Amino acid sequence: SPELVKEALKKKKVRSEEAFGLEYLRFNDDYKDIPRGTAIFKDFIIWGYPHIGRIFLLETGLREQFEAPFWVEEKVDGYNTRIFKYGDNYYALSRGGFICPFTTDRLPDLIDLRILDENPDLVICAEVAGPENPYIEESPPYVKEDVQLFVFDFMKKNEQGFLSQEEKMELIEKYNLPHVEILGRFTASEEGIKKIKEILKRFNEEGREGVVFKEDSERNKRAKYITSYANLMDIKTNAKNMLQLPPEYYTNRILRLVLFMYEEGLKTTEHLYEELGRAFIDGLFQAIEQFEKEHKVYKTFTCKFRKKENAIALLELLSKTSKHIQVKERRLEKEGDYWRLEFDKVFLNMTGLLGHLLSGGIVY
Amino acid sequence: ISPELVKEALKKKKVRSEEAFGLEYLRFNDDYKDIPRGTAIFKDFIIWGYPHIGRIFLLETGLREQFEAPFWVEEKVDGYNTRIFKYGDNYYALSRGGFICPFTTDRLPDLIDLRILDENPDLVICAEVAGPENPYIEESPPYVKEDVQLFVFDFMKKNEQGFLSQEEKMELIEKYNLPHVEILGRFTASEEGIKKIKEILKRFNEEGREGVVFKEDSERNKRAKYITSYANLMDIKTNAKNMLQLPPEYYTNRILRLVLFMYEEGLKTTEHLYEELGRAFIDGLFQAIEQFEKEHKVYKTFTCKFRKKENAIALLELLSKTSKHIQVKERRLEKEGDYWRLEFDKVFLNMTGLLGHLLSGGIVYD
Ligand SMILES: Nc1ncnc2c1ncn2[C@@H]1O[C@H](CO)[C@@H](O)[C@H]1O
Ligand SMILES: Nc1ncnc2c1ncn2[C@@H]1O[C@H](CO)[C@@H](O)[C@H]1O
Ligand SMILES: [Ca+2]
Ligand SMILES: [Ca+2]
C-alpha cells in the first residue's frame, strides 16, 4: 500500500533513489513481509529476492526442512543480481536494491537479453562472479578472468515467488542462457544423503562454495548448505574487515565448521583445527605486513566497463554504503574496448588500530 | 564527586542504591564522567572503584612507549577482583561491580588476617581471589589446588582515588604478613630489562600463568598489563558456552593479542599457535555439543564453601540478578565439616536453545 510507504519512510526503512535517469523507492531494510531490496518504480515493483535459510547439519537438515524431493543447484560465490527491462533499456539491481552501475553497464557482455524483449514480465535472478568484480574479492575456481553471470531463478514483475524448476529450465534451454549447475533431483533418504555428501566432498576438494536445495512443491522451500572450505575462506577473507563486522559473523561461521565436524566425526576432520587457526591468523598477519609497508590497510579491486560514466557511478555507490572504509580510485584508463578501473577499499579503523598497537599503544 | 553528579546518574541509571549485610549504599553500575564503575558510596565514606588497566599487545615497544620511569613487574593472577574494608567492627568485600560479595565477605577470616584494617581503618585492600572452588570463574591458577586463596596487589584509601606507592605497599604486606601477588622486581625498558622481562613471560607462559601487571614507580603511577598466549587461548576455550553473550570485539581483540605476539616473536617459531587457536574455538564448542547431547542443557557447574548458610543463599540470589539469559540453578547445599558446601549451575539458555535448533536440523537466516 501507500501507508506502508509512509511508515517505512518516516522510520528510515524505505528511501527514494535517483539513478540512471530514474526515480524510485528502495527498501534499504526488511520490513513486515516486504523483503529488503524490493524496488518500487513508477510502472512496477521488482520484489526483493527472499532470504534462503542455512542448515548446519546436512542429514538432519534435509530431513527436517523438506517435504518432497528437491533440486540440488551449485551455489556460486559472487553477488546476487536481478535484471529487468524498463522501456527500451535494461537494469541490474543489487540485493540491496540499488541499480548496479557495473552489472548494468556490462549486461550485453554477460547475457543475451532477448528473453526480456520477448518476455518483459520476467526478472532474471543471477549470480555474477569472477576475479574482477567490484564487490567481493573471491572468485569461483573455474572463472579466471573478468566476470561471468549464472542464472539461478526467474521472478516476475509485481510477483513474489519463482517459476517452477521446470519452467526455469524451459526458459534456460530455449534461450541458451548461462546458469548454475543442476546436480539433480534428490531426497533425504539414505541413498540421497550419501550422494549429496559425495557432491559436497568434491565441491570442497575443488574450492566450490556449496549448494542450494529447492523443493519440488507449490511452496518451493529453499535452503543452502556451505562447504567448510568456503566458511574458512570467509573468515580469512574478512581479516582486514574485523572491526566492521559483528562478533556474530565469526561465531556463526565457527559453529558451521564445528557442526560439520560433529556431523562427519573428528577423525575425518582434524585438519580443520590448523586451518581455522590459519584463517584468522594469516589474514591478520597479512594486514600487519601491509601496514608496515604502506601505512594503510586495504584491498585492491579491479574491473572493466563499457563506459567511463559507469565506472564513476560505481565508485560513488560503493562510497555511499561503505563507512569508515575509504573507496579510493587508483586508475581509470581506456584499455582496448573497455575502461579499466582499479580502486582500493581502505579500512581506516583497522589502519588506526594496527598503527596504534604496533607503536606500543594501550587499549582497554 | 558531588550531589548533582550522583543525582544525574540516578536519573541516567549509572548509579543504584543497594542494600546488603545491613548496609544501604549507592553503587556505580557503569563508568560515569570519570567515576569508575564499582564505586560505592557509603554514608561515612566512599570506596572508589578499581580503575581500568590498559593492555599492551607488543611487549618491547609497549614498555618502551608507555613508561618514563622504572617499573615494578607483578604477577597477574587469574581470579576475581576484590576490595576489602572495615566499617564499624565488621569487614566487607566488594566485587568489581561494587556489590558486597556474600561469598568473599563470608570467607574473609579464612582468606586474610584483617588486623591491618583494625590498625589502619582508612585502608582498602585490593586483592585477587582465586581457586578452583569459587563461584565466579571456572578457571584456577595452577598453584591453588583447592578452595580459594587471596592475593593482595594494591591498597587504596577510603575517599581517595589513587594507590599507595610500591614501597608503602611492600611495607604493609611485610608488616602484617599478607598473602601477595609474586613480585618479579623493578625494571627499565632497556635492552637488559627487556631481555629479562621476556624471559619472565616465556616462563610464565610455559607455567600456565596469566601474565603480569607493570606499575610505574612514580607519582602518576601508570599501569599496564600483558597476557600470555596460553591464557589468551584458554580464555577463548573456556568461553565457548558463553559465545552468544560476546562483546563487540572479543574476536578482533583476543586474536590480535595472539597475532601480535606471533609477530613480535616471529612466525617461524610460533607456528603451533595455528592448531592451538583452532582447538581453542573448536574443542570448547565440541564439548558444549557433547554436553548438550548428554544432558540436554548447556551449563557450567560451580562449587564453593561457606561458613554461613544465609551467605550461600545470598550468593545464589546475587547471581540471578546479574546473569540474565543465564539461569542460576542450585544443585547441592549441604553441611560439610564446619562449612556449608554449595554447588550450582549456570545454564546458558540461548546456547542451549541454539544448539537444540541446529542439531535437530533447524534453519538459520543469516
Ligand atoms: N544456485 C543458486 N540458487 C540460489 N542462490 C544462489 C545460487 N548460487 C548463488 N546464489 C546466491 O546465494 C544467495 C542466498 O540467498 C543468493 O542471494 C544468491 O545471490
Ligand atoms: N598483580 C596485579 N595487579 C593489579 N591487578 C591484578 C593483579 N593480579 C590480578 N589482577 C586483576 O587483573 C585485573 C586487571 O584489570 C584487575 O582488576 C585485578 O582484579
Ligand atoms: Ca566465500
Ligand atoms: Ca584466563
CA-derived radius of gyration, chain B: 22
Tell me which residue has its CA closest to atom 6 in ligand 2: B76
Q: Test B258 with A272 for CB contact under 8 angstroms.
A: no
CA-based max dimension of chain B = 65
β-sheet bridge partners, residue B186: B72
Which residue in B61, B278, B358 is closest to A276 by CB distance? B278
Q: Which residues, listed in sequence order, are joined to residue A30 by a DSSP beta bridge? A: none
Q: Which of B326, B69, B35, B16 is CA-nearest to residue B221?
A: B69
A210-215 and A14-19 as β-strands: parallel, antiparallel, unpaired?
unpaired
CATH class of A47-226: alpha beta
C-alpha to C-alpha distance for A124 and A153, rounded to whole angstroms: 7
Q: A77 CB less than 6 Å from ligand 1?
A: no
Check residue B240 and report its DSSP letter: G
Task: Tell me which DSSP letter residue B366 carries.
Answer: -
Show the CA angle centred on residue B75, arms to residues B69 and B77, nearest 5°. Answer: 140
Q: Which residue has the cell 565508485?
A: A315
Does the annotation list B215 as a binding residue? yes
Strand ordering across the sheet containing A325-335? A298-305, A338-347, A325-335
The dihedrals phi and psi of A253, each to the nearest 5 degrees, come to -70, -30
Half-sphere exposure of A4 (CA within 13 A, CB side): 13
Burial class (CB in 10 A: 0-12, 13-18, 19+), A200: buried
**How many CB atoms are closer than 10 A to CB B194?**
17
Distance CA A282, CA A293 (A): 17
Nearest to A274 among B249, B274, B362 (CB): B274
Q: Which of B62, B244, B282 sits opposite A273 (nearest CB)?
A: B282
Q: Report the CATH number of the A227-364 domain.
A: 3.30.70.2160
Report the residue of B37, B282, B285, B293 to disrupt the A interface, i.e. the one with the largest count of A CBs within 10 Å.
Answer: B282
Experimental method: X-ray
Question: B285 and A258 in contact by Cβ < 8 A?
Answer: yes
The whole-angstrom separation of Cα A143 and Cα A73 is 18
C-alpha cell at B68: 618514563
Distance (Å, whole) CA A11 – CA A50:
22
Q: Are A259 and A227 in contact (CB under 8 A)?
A: no
Spatial distance between the Cα atoms of B55 and B62, rounded to a whole number of angstroms: 9
Grid cell locating A36: 529488503
Best probe of the B interface among A362, A363, A364, by most B CBs < 10 A, is A362
Instruction: Give the Cα separation of A33 and A1 in Å (integer).
Output: 12
B19's CB contacts (< 8 A; 6+ apart) are: B25
Rounded distance between C-alpha atoms, residue B307 and residue B332, angstroms:
15
Cell numbers placing B310: 544465609
Query: How far is residue B352 CA from its own chain's centroid?
Result: 26
Closest CA to B193 of B75, B76, B64: B64
A267: exposed, middle or buried (Cβ count in 10 Å: 0-12, 13-18, 19+): exposed
> CA end-to-end span of chain A, whole Å?
49
- Backbone phi and psi for residue A163, each to the nearest 5 degrees, phi listed first: -55, 135
Distances (CA, A) of A221 to A141, A162, A216, B52, B143: 28, 10, 8, 51, 57
**Does domain B228-366 correspond to CATH entry 3.30.930.10?**
no
Taking every pair of Cα atoms in chain A, the longest distance, rounded to a whole number of angstroms, is: 65
Q: Which ligand is nearest to the CA of A234?
A: 3
CA neighbor of B317 nearest in space, from B140, B137, B99, B133: B99
Residues of chain B with CATH 3.10.450.740: 1-47
Q: Do A288 and B258 touch (CB under 8 A)?
A: no
Resolution (A): 2.3
B361–A64 C-beta distance less than 8 A: yes
Cβ pair B312, B128 in contact under 8 A:
no
Given ligand 1 and candidates A80, A103, A147, A208, which is best to mutate, with the most ligand atoms within 8 Å of its CB?
A80
Paired sense of beta strands A222-226 and A53-55, if any:
parallel
CA nearest to A81, candidates A13, A159, A147: A147
- Nearest residue to B16 (alpha-carbon basis) of B38, B34, B36, B46: B38
Contact A305, A258 (CB under 8 A): no
Interhelix angle A272-294/A248-264, rounded to 10 degrees, is 150
Domain with CATH 3.30.470.30 in chain B: 48-227
Q: Do residues A281 and B273 lie in contact, with contact meaning Cβ atoms separated by under 8 Å?
A: yes
Find the Cα–Cα–Cα–Cα dihedral B311, B314, B316, B321, rounded to 10°: -150
Residues B1-47, CATH architecture: Roll (3.10)
Ligand 2 centre to CA of B254 (Å) is 18
- Alpha-carbon gap, residue A10 to B169, rounded angstroms: 61
Q: Do the bridges between strand A222-226 and strand A210-215 make them parallel or antiparallel, or are there none, so unpaired?
A: antiparallel
Q: Within its chain, how far is the Cα of A232 from the centroid?
A: 16
Please tell me the distance from the alpha carbon of residue A196 to that of residue A211, in angstroms, as a whole number: 9
Minimal Cα distance from B247: which residue of A?
A247
Nearest-atom index, ligand 1, CA of A50: 15
**B189: Cα within 13 Å, side-chain hemisphere:** 17
Sign of CA dihedral B283, B289, B294, B300: positive
d(CA B349, CA B327): 7
Top-level class of domain B48-227: alpha beta
* Contacts for B326 with CB less than 8 Å, ≥ 6 apart: B245, B346, B347, B348, B349
Contact B2, B26 (CB under 8 A): no
What atom in ligand 2 is closest to the CA of residue B78? 9
Number of neighbours of residue A205 by Cβ within 10 angstroms: 10
- Judge contact between B98 and B37, C-beta under 8 A: yes
**Residue B151 burial (10 A CB sphere; 0-12, 13-18, 19+):** buried
- Check: CB of residue A73 under 8 Å from CB of residue A211: yes
Q: Could you tell me if A208 and A141 are in contact, meaning their C-beta atoms sit under 8 angstroms apart?
A: yes
CB contact at 8 A, A203 and A58: no
Contact of A234 with A275, CB cutoff 8 Å: no
> Are the C-beta atoms of residues A124 and A180 closer than 8 Å to each other?
no
Whole-number Å distance between alpha carbons of B211 and B232: 10
**CB distance A24 to A43 below 8 Å:** no
Pairwise CA distance, residues A279 & A294, whole Å: 23
Measured between CA atoms, the residue of chain A closest to residue B54 is A364
CB B24 within 8 Å of CB B17: yes
Which residues, including other chains, have CB under 8 Å from residue B138's CB and lie 6 or more apart? Answer: B238, B300, B302
Instruction: Write the residue with the smallest CA distance to atom 6 of ligand 1.
Output: A75
For testing the chain B interface, which of A251, A263, A290, A351 should be mutated: the one with the most B CBs within 10 Å? A251
Nearest to A357 by CA among B246, B256, B295, B305: B256
Sign of the Cα torsion A185, A188, A192, A197 reads positive
Sorted by sequence, the CB contacts under 8 Å of residue B324 that are 6+ apart come out as: none
Q: Looking at the domain that runs over A1-46, which CATH code has it been given?
A: 3.10.450.740
Strands B80-87 vs B211-216: parallel, antiparallel or unpaired: unpaired
| Sequence-ordered list of residues with C-beta below 8 angstroms from that of B108, at least 6 positions apart, any chain | B84, B91, B93, B114
DSSP B124-190: EEEEEEE-TT-SS-S---TT--SS-EEEEEEEEETT--S---HHHHHHHHHHHT--B--EEEEE-SS
In three state form, how does the secondary structure of A215-271 look? ECCCCCCEEEEECHHHHHHHHHHCHHHHHHCCCHHHHHHHHHHHHHHHHHCHHHCCC
For chain B, the residue count is 366
Q: What is the DSSP string of B64-89?
A: HHH-SS-EEEEEE-SSEEEEEEEETT
C-alpha cell at B162: 589513587
Strand, coil or helix: A12 = coil
Measured between its terminal Cα atoms, the distance across chain B in Å is: 47
Dist. CA A156–CA B286, nearest whole Å: 45
Interhelix angle for A228-237 vs A248-264, to 10°? 160
Tell me the CA–centroid distance for residue B232 and ligand 4, in Å: 6
Integer Cα distance of B358 and A154 in angstroms? 30
Angstrom distance (rounded) from CA B278 to CA B250 = 15
Distances B18 to A67, A205, B99, B159 between C-alpha atoms, Å: 56, 60, 8, 19
Q: Could you give the residue range(s) of every CATH 3.10.450.740 domain in chain A?
A: 1-46
